[PDB]
């Protein structure tokens, strides 16, 4: 349409827009506290982690790198950090 509000875009469009083509760029990634059943140590982890993040002393693999976002090991949950 001729009249489109470019200044205040629709939030659904902004979410379903490429990260670089938004009115202001914003990454689609996030940091998450992963909780693994067992040693119950919250571990900060990058969503698209490319290395194998390991427990500190718990010495277990928490995530597995992939082509996109890192795949959390089974039995581990995560919570987004603000």
């Amino acid at each position: 349409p001729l009249a489109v509000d470019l200044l205040h875009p629709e939030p659904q469009r902004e979410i379903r827009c490429h990260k670089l083509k938004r009115l202001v760029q914003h990454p689609n990634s996030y940091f998450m506290d992963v909780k693994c059943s067992g040693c119950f140590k919250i571990s900060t982890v990058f969503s698209h982690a490319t290395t194998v993040v390991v427990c500190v002393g718990c010495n277990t693999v928490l995530c597995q790198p992939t082509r996109g976002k890192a795949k959390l090991t089974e039995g581990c949950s995560f919570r987004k950090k603000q």
Binding site: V4, L23, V24
Partner: protein, 129 residues
């Protein structure tokens, strides 16, 4: 490789105006672009514009009043003296009654009318009408 942000911005404005859009987004902003748009605003060829900040060059969003026939850039920035200002205006502008020729002088960025009134030359930036 991008080498003239002003040229790209004026091309985007021209395309949006031809398509009849009410707003147009200009990619990387700059002081030169801001002053060009400000002169166009003072002369009434565009509506208000908003400079979107994104911790980089930024963007602009200009409201179009559907009153601009053409906005173009002259590259390279040739040096215009007061003596040939008349020839350049007669060559580039559609008529003597309207249309403005934007210069960049030491006093700043202005139109050829103000440049002549202040008796200033400088480097040509573009024109609109």
């Amino acid at each position: 490789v991008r080498m003239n942000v002003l040229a790209d911005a004026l091309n985007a404005i021209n395309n949006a105006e031809k398509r009849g859009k009410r707003q147009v987004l200009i990619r990387p902003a700059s002081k030169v672009i801001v002053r060009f748009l400000t002169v166009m605003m003072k002369h009434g060829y565009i509506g208000e514009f908003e400079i979107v900040d994104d911790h980089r060059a930024g963007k602009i969003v200009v409201n179009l009043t559907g009153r601009l026939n053409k906005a173009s850039v002259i590259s390279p920035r040739l040096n215009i003296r007061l003596n040939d200002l008349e020839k350049y205006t007669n060559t580039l502008l559609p008529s003597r009654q309207f249309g403005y020729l934007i210069l960049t002088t030491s006093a700043g960025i202005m139109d050829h009318e103000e440049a002549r009134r202040k008796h200033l030359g400088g480097k040509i930036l573009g024109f609109f009408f």
